[model samples]
Target: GSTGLIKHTEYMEFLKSVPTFQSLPEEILSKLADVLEETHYENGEYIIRQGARGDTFFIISKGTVNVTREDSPSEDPVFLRTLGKGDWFGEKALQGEDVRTANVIAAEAVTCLVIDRDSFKHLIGGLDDVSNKAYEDAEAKAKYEAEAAF
Candidate 1:
């Protein structure tokens, strides 16, 4: 099975270091970590658009994206910046911000870890009933990779 093996620990570590999650036990921390999407996109795909309503938060895992601004509805977007590995985007929308203010496009094939909903909501709503089956998949993949070498 295709598993996001390497980044599981990466996600856990990054979240634990954040002030909001630092106090959270590994129980809920891992639960929250599992909700983050491990998403990838190809070159030139639109990730965010100006004036678009926003709900997700994104952080670069690898590769990069170009940030540009819509000068206005009458004109094409102008290049603002290029950001790579570890840069955060669509962040303001997680709080009070309602709409995207810039156009974000992939500069290359990129991987992003993203939150589809407010993380605080997930935290307060403890994921107690979930079985956490993905962790077992991780262990199973560990052995599968070893078996493939044989």
Candidate 2:
């Protein structure tokens, strides 16, 4: 039922525009398109929240988003910046971080191209080999990860 839109060109182009994504090998980009998921947000919806576990990357395909952070208990959330078409966040999750760093709320109706850690793994071919064998030493495996998250 959910087979649609993985190769959706519009999302592919937007993913191409984001710097982090653009740096990916061109072939990797198509796989990103192949595994990409699409999600929508109505006005006022919380697209992401501070400190929540994040497992995916977000590519804003349409509309605007308010990026904010809660810096203090006594003060209101601080405004960071606004993001719109072609903008993205949560790459840190792909780097193995679990916590979201900020809150992103939809300014209005919005669309996004999404890729979770699960989908991200199988999309990169060599990682398919790595995920299986790379953890031969669990402690050192996690150690290597922390270094990347470093």
Candidate 3:
């Protein structure tokens, strides 16, 4: 009925607020929203573990998370930064099919909207510009790290 349509409209409004998805066309955004799954994490829980394969991308819908990575395979992880609402992670996994490059841990009770790899590819893979940008960004990061190592 009209009630369901109104709720759908309201939810689209919510999706429009997300920075990453906002740029997508409304049709694409709607499809993305349909596939997104919400997940909850308690404070101190690991959201994604470094060196593990990950197939999902996450947008922080509530609360904060700490981003960390090991300095070296034998060294302990160093805290890199903290992220809050609207921030996202896990693109590397989606882009390269690589293992998670860092660990994300909930700093407080957190809620995230997640998209699995298949749906992510379905949504973004066909977008030439978006796919190119992701590849370029990853390339640049790799180049920067290689240069810094010298």
Candidate 4:
């Protein structure tokens, strides 16, 4: 029953556009696609909530989302960012961060491509490794800042 969703051409096409996967090694993309799970959300449904211990990362295949922190109930979920078409979030979860930093919910009907942390790391580790120079630069800056404290 669930297999029908992934076999859709449209979803597969959208998957191809996701930056994390676009131009990625074909072998990696195929494995990630094979293990992925798809899910739907209705308007106002909570897709992720701040501080929740969910390690599933997501790709927004369609629809918009509102991302807000737990303490900001009065303010409209500050459009810290909007995701649609081929955007994804929750990458931090793959790094083993248990607490979600923001709350994400469907601003309308949504389709998500989700993967567990284990699969996520296995698939994206190559990309992460390739991007090490940039990561190291940022890490060094962070370390320097910490040591320079007032």
State each model's CA lDDT, in order.
0.73, 0.77, 0.78, 0.73
Which stretches in model 2 have alpha-carbon errors above 4 Å? 1-7, 125-150
Identify the candidate with maximal lDDT: 3
Q: How large is the C-alpha RMSD of every model relative to the true structure? A: 14.1, 6.4, 5.0, 6.0
C-alpha-based local distance difference test score of model 1: 0.73
lDDT for each residue of candidate 1 in 1-150, tens digit (9 for 90 to 100):
335655677887766654434555687777767877889999999988878988887878889999999777788779889988867787556544478889899999999888865674555455343433443344466658879999
User: Which candidate has the top score in TM-score?
Assistant: 2
Count of backbone clashes for each model?
0, 0, 0, 0
Task: Please provide TM-scores, in order, for all candidate models, with all chains considered together.
Answer: 0.65, 0.74, 0.70, 0.66
Which run of 10 residues does model 3 get worst, by summed lDDT?
14-23
Q: For candidate 4, what is the total of clashing residue pairs?
A: 0
Tens-place lDDT per residue, model 4, 8-123, is 54455655775434556566666777776878999999899888898987888779888866556686555567778677888667656578878898999999888888876765
TM-score of predicted structure 2:
0.74
Q: Tens digits of per-residue lDDT for model 2 on 22-75?
A: 545666677788777779999989899899999998888889999999999999
Determine which window of 10 residues in candidate 4 has minimal summed lDDT.
130-139
Cα RMSD, model 1:
14.1
Off by over 4 Å in 3: 1-22, 72-76, 125-150
lDDT of 3 at 134: 61
Ordering by TM-score: 2, 3, 4, 1
| TM-score, predicted candidate 4 vs. hidden true structure | 0.66
- The lDDT, on a scale of 0 to 1, for candidate 3 is 0.78
Model 1 ranges off by over 4 Å: 1-6, 16-28, 73-76, 118-120, 124-150
